[PDB]
Amino acid sequence: DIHRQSVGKLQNVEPDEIKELCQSETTQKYGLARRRLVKLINSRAKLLSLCSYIIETCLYILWRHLEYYLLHCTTQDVDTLLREGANSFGESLQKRLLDIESLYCKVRSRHSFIQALVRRIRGLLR
Amino acid sequence: EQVKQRVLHTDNVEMAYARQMYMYNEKVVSL
């Protein structure tokens, strides 16, 4: 959200507004504003890609840990695992993941890999 | 990107067909 919004403010770049607009960084004011906004755009892009990574990794880590912990843990743990797992990855989480993957991922990755990981997480969950 | 590449990464009958292909390869050098 802050990212699309900053991008809009940038594409619509043109004292209180100028003061608060230089405070985190008229012609030099406008240049400084372009600078700070592009900086925030980069920071957002980076936090965003780092998000993408954190999500995808966490998916891989959970998948492997759960396969090993229910399919190959010699025994409550696996049962409580299935239970709290159908509980935690309620459809809110999954639809949130697909909503994001549609929001941003289509513009940076040729593969909605998150969609696949969601499918497999469900398939081992159900 | 490497994580993603790794992600996309993640018998007797065959022995017979394989010997057959071995012979085919030899010849080429109908499956």
How many whole angstroms separate alpha carbon A62 and alpha carbon A48?
21
CB-CB contact of A35 with A1 (8 Å): no
Measure in Å the smallest separation between the Cα of A116 and chain B Cα atoms. 10
CB-CB contact of A21 with A36 (8 Å): yes
How many whole angstroms separate alpha carbon A107 and alpha carbon A91?
24
Experimental technique? cryo-EM
Q: What is the resolution of this structure in A?
A: 4.2
How many whole angstroms separate alpha carbon A63 and alpha carbon A58?
8
Q: How many CB pairs under 8 A join A and B?
A: 14
How many whole angstroms separate alpha carbon B29 and alpha carbon B31?
14
Q: B interface mutation test: which of A52, A60, A117, A118 has the most B CBs within 10 A?
A: A60
Measure in Å the smallest separation between the Cα of A104 and chain B Cα atoms. 17
